[PDB]
Amino acid sequence: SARTTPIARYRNIGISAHIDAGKTTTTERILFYTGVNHKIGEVHDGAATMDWMEQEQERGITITSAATTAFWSGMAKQYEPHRINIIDTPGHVDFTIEVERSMRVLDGAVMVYCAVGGVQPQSETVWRQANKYKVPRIAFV
RNA sequence: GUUUAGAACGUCGUGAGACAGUUCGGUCCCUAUCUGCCGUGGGCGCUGGAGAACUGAGGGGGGCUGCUCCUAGUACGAGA
Ligand SMILES: Nc1nc2c(ncn2[C@@H]2O[C@H](COP(=O)(O)OP(=O)(O)OP(=O)(O)O)[C@@H](O)[C@H]2O)c(=O)[nH]1
Ligand SMILES: [Mg+2]
Ligand SMILES: [Mg+2]
Ligand SMILES: [Mg+2]
Ligand SMILES: [Mg+2]
Ligand SMILES: [Mg+2]
Ligand SMILES: [Mg+2]
Numbered sequence: 001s002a003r004t005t006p007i008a009r010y011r012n013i014g015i016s017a018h019i020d021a022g023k024t025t026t027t028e029r030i031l032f033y034t035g036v037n038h039k040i041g042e043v044h045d046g047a048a049t050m051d052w053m054e055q056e057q058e059r060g061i062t063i064t065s066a067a068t069t070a071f072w073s074g075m076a077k078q079y080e081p082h083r084i085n086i087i088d089t090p091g092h093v094d095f096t097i098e099v100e101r102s103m104r105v106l107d108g109a110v111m112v113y114c115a116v117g118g119v120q121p122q123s124e125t126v127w128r129q130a131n132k133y134k135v136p137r138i139a140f141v
Numbered sequence: 142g143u144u145u146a147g148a149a150c151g152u153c154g155u156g157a158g159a160c161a162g163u164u165c166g167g168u169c170c171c172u173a174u175c176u177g178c179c180g181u182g183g184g185c186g187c188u189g190g191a192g193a194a195c196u197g198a199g200g201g202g203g204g205c206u207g208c209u210c211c212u213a214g215u216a217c218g219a220g221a
Contacts, residue, residue, distance in 0.1 A: 019220065044214055059221085060214080092220065121219045 005071075005083045012107035014087035016099055016130065018120035021112050024050045024062055026140065027088045034070035034084075050088045062090040065102045091122050099129050109137035 015023040024043045027050050031037040041047030046057035050066050066088055071081040087106065089099045103109065109130050113123065130137055
């Protein structure tokens with residue numbers, strides 16, 4: 001019953017953005033690259049793993065906050081396998097509670113942004129929710 | 142179906158009968174002369190006669206559209 005991964009190698013990251021900014025797409029790609037999934041499933045095809053719930057495969061949105069983990073070592077494997085507990089949160093204003101609950105406990109965040117339209121009405125809302133809890137965040141255009 | 146002759150009901154009439162009342166049953170002919178049209182030939186013409194290949198003035202035919210997929214979850218839209 002020893003420590004499998006050192007606690008310094010943990011990353012409690014999570015995704016928050018405006019609707020259709022590409023949160024679920026990034027997580028799907030992560031899982032695939034890290035080896036958790038064996039295929040890439042698109043969200044508008046209903047085949048993304050993070051949108052597990054029906055009315056999420058049908059409508060094409062994310063409603064709940066689903067938490068998974070993965071092991072990433074770097075491109076050229078520059079470090080030991082770090083464990084990332086990535087969390088995909090919905091970007092809609094109808095589910096702001098699903099961001100705040102997930103950003104209560106996240107150690108790090110990353111604010112993904114659409115390149116053609118950068119800062120959208122819900123981009124500012126998840127930014128204020130993140131700085132409420134003083135979360136250190138990155139940005140992925 | 143309606144629009145003959147048979148019969149019956151309801152109704153009307155003393156009655157024969159009658160009802161845009163309703164019921165059952167009840168003969169639909171024509172070998173195409175002309176025009177028209179569809180085809181298919183004969184004659185003559187086109188200026189010596191003939192065999193072929195053509196040009197195109199003109200005429201006719203034809204012209205319908207669904208559903209998916211890509212563009213693209215792109216434009217628009219806070220979102221949907
Ligand atoms: N051209 C292009 N389309 C992308 C890209 N990333 C995502 N999309 C499309 O945008 C939609 C994905 O947006 P999502 O990330 O699934 O929605 P979300 O950001 O996870 O957040 P919620 O809607 O609240 O659940 C799909 O149609 C994607 O194919 C990209 O990098 N380039
Ligand atoms: Mg858009
Ligand atoms: Mg959508
Ligand atoms: Mg999503
Ligand atoms: Mg005549
Ligand atoms: Mg013509
Ligand atoms: Mg599409």
